[PDB]
Every structure is written in C-alpha cells, then in structure tokens.
C-alpha cells in the first residue's frame, strides 16, 4: 500500500504515535472505498476527549494548529507518491 507507506513515513518523521483501527462502514469513506478508491480516516486530534455529537464539543487551539502542521507534511508526501500501475 504506497499511500499507507507515505502516510506512515510522515508520522514516523513527526514522531506521531498512530493507533490503526478498523474503518467504519459509515461516513464519506464508505462510498469512496466502495467505488474502489483507497482511503484513510484521520483527524489530527490527540489529547482531546471524544466529543463528536456531544454537548461542549471543543478543540484546543494548539492541537488545531499542530494539526495544520501535520497536514503540511502529509500533503507533500501523498501528492509526491511516484506513478503507480493504477495511474495508467
């Protein structure tokens, strides 16, 4: 999986500990994966209580800003994966 390889390499470069979990059969990725597109589910929120759909859903601004930094490293890696069989 070249995409997982590039994602995982950036996370090792940044010293981020990942916990891979199964992909729920829900959300936008349900449909994208079902039409054959490889995908991951990821939001760069650590040290954050799990509050989706709850009262007082909140995010600390420094976690948010570190998340923008993480995407500034993920994007070059993913967008620079060299040509694959699937590109033809």
């Amino acid at each position: 999986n070249p995409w997982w390889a590039a994602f995982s390499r950036v996370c090792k470069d940044m010293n981020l500990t990942l916990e891979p979990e199964i992909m729920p059969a829900a959300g936008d990725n349900r449909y994208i994966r079902a039409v054959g597109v490889p995908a991951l589910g990821f939001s760069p929120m650590n040290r954050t209580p799990v509050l989706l759909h709850d009262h007082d859903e909140r995010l600390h601004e420094a976690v948010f800003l570190r998340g923008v930094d993480i995407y500034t490293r993920l994007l070059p890696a993913l967008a620079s994966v060299p040509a694959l069989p699937s590109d033809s």
Binding site: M23, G27, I32, P38, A39, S43, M45, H53, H55, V81
Partner: protein, 192 residues
C-alpha cells in the same frame, strides 16, 4: 484581538450554521467559493440533488495525468440541545485556556480548515507536487450521505477527478496517540 489567522478562519467557519436538519449550506458553499478565489484554487460546484451542492477546490499538480489526492470532508453537523452547553454551540467562543467550543469543532470542520490552511501555506510558500489535490466539501454526511457523497461518486464530475487516494475524518483520541481508520483491498463491508 491577537490570534493565529488559521484559528480565526476556523472560528469563522464554525459560526456558519450548517446544522441538521436544515443546514445553511448556501453560506458554506459561498465561504468555500470565496476561499477558492482568495487562495487561487479552481472551484467547481456540483449540485447532486436540488439543494445539495458538492464543492470541489482544485490545486493542479505538475503531472496532471497522475491520479489525484482527495482531501474530503462533510460540511453538515449534528443538532444540539443548546441548554446543555457552556457556550453557544455556533458562537465558536475560545476560552482563556485556549479551548474553542462549537458544534463541529471536532466533527469535522477542524479538518476542512486544516486542509485549506495546509494547502494555502504550501502553495503560497512555493511548493509544487506531481499529483493534483482536490478538496471536496460534501453536504449530508450526518444523515447517511444519500444526497451527498453517495450520489457524488456516480457523477461524471467525480470520475473526472481521477482519484487515486482519499483522506476524510478520523476521531479524537484522549491520549498522546492519534487514531487512524485503515482499510485496504476491498473494504470489509463489501466482503459482504
């Protein structure tokens, strides 16, 4: 007030009331259109069902025939019982300890703004990559996507993106680790 401009943009978008069951999608589409114009990104609106516009922002790569990177997210958020909140869920109040309170602050408007600010920084700082990046902002995820992403993936405008790989939401983790939803080959829910 002094504030990081990425945080200011996040709080602006948190204040757009894309709350189910009748999200202000018109205001969200307008926000993405104006952002595309400010960032110098191409913008395509694809109305998959009446009242349901998918917005695609595009940063073409240097090898536009390679398949693209999709940075996907949903613009709607679930309802609130506002009497149970410490701060108005659509005010995006930031407290003196740095916490931003809003419906959508975790799920998932943070990620949409993170994609936009990461693209803005990399592009304005002069980076270029072989693969095109498309940011797709879809309505309707919180009710199952049947008038959003589920329709978008059959559209000719979707096929034209030539998607090679997508990101979309994960979930908060209370520890120092980050959760990542992993899938490979054919997803497990079609196995069947």
């Amino acid at each position: 007030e002094e504030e990081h401009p990425s945080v200011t943009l996040f709080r602006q978008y948190l204040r757009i009331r894309t709350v189910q069951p009748k999200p202000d999608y018109g205001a969200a589409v307008a926000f993405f259109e104006e952002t595309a114009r400010q960032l110098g990104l191409g913008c395509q609106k694809v109305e998959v069902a009446p009242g349901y516009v998918v917005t695609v922002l595009t940063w073409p790569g240097t090898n536009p025939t390679l398949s693209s990177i999709l940075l996907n997210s949903h613009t709607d958020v679930v309802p609130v019982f506002k009497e149970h909140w410490s701060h108005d869920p659509f005010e995006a109040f930031k407290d003196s300890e740095g916490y931003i309170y809003a419906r959508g602050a975790q799920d998932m408007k943070c990620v949409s703004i993170q994609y936009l600010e990461a693209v803005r920084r990399l592009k304005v700082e002069g980076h270029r990559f072989p693969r095109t990046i498309h940011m797709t902002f879809v309505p309707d995820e919180e009710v199952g996507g049947h008038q959003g992403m589920e329709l978008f993936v059959q559209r000719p405008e979707f096929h034209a993106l030539r998607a090679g790989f997508a990101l979309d939401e994960g979930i908060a983790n209370p520890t120092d680790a980050f959760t990542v939803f992993y899938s490979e080959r054919s997803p497990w829910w079609v196995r069947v």
